[PDB]
Design a protein around this ligand. Structure first.
Ligand SMILES: [Zn+2]
Lengths: 117, 68
C-alpha cells in the first residue's frame, strides 16, 4: 500500500493533474470532481477534524487515516528545497485531493479493489 | 535613498489562519450549508468564490457587482 500510494502520488506529480490545496479541494468538491484523497485524522486540530470528515463523508470521497498533519506535506513534495537531503524548512498540509489521470498503476488496482469491497 | 513625503505602503495581504471555517458554516449535520451564495454567470466557475459586502454582492472574475 505504501509503495503503491507513493508511486501514484509520484506519477500524479509527473502529470500535474492534481489540484493541491484545501481551496482547490473545495473547488473540486463544489464542481463534483472527487475520486480519491489523502487525509490525516486524530491530529491536534482544534475544530478541523469534524469539518474534514463532514466534507469527506458527503459526496462519496475515499477515507485514509494518517497520524499527524505535519508529515503530510512530504507525499506531494511542498517544501522540497535542497532535495539532496532531508527537508527541514517545511510546513505541513491539511489535505490534498488528486484528480488522477494516470490511474492505472502497479498496485492501485488492488488498492481500489480494497476500496470497492 | 530616503525621501521627504512618507512612503505609502503597498497593500500586502494580511495573515489569516484557518480561514475556510468562516466560509463554510459548520452546523449540526454534515451538510455544507454555506451562507455565501452562488454566482449565476457561467463565465466564472462555481468554485471561484465571490465578494461578501453590506449593500452589494460583487461577483468573481466577471467584474459584475450585483448590487441591491
Ligand atoms: Zn460571475
Amino acid at each position: 500500500v505504501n509503495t503503491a500510494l507513493q508511486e501514484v502520488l509520484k506519477t500524479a506529480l509527473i502529470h500535474d493533474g492534481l489540484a493541491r490545496g484545501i481551496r482547490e479541494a473545495a473547488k473540486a468538491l463544489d464542481k463534483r470532481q472527487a475520486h480519491l484523497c489523502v487525509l490525516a485524522s486524530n491530529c491536534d486540530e482544534p475544530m478541523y477534524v469534524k469539518l474534514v470528515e463532514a466534507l469527506c463523508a458527503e459526496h462519496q470521497i475515499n477515507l485514509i487515516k494518517v497520524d499527524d498533519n505535519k508529515k503530510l506535506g512530504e507525499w506531494v513534495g511542498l517544501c522540497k528545497i535542497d532535495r539532496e537531503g532531508k527537508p527541514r524548512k517545511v510546513v505541513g498540509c491539511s489535505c490534498v485531493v488528486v484528480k488522477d489521470y494516470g490511474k492505472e498503476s502497479q498496485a492501485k488496482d488492488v488498492i481500489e479493489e480494497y476500496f470497492k469491497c | 535613498k530616503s525621501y521627504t513625503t512618507p512612503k505609502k505602503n503597498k497593500h500586502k495581504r494580511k495573515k489569516v489562519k484557518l480561514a475556510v471555517l468562516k466560509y463554510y458554516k459548520v452546523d449540526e449535520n454534515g451538510k455544507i450549508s454555506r451562507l455565501r451564495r452562488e454566482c449565476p454567470s457561467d463565465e466564472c466557475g462555481a468554485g471561484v468564490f465571490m465578494a461578501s459586502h453590506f449593500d452589494r454582492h460583487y461577483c468573481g472574475k466577471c467584474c459584475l457587482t450585483y448590487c441591491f
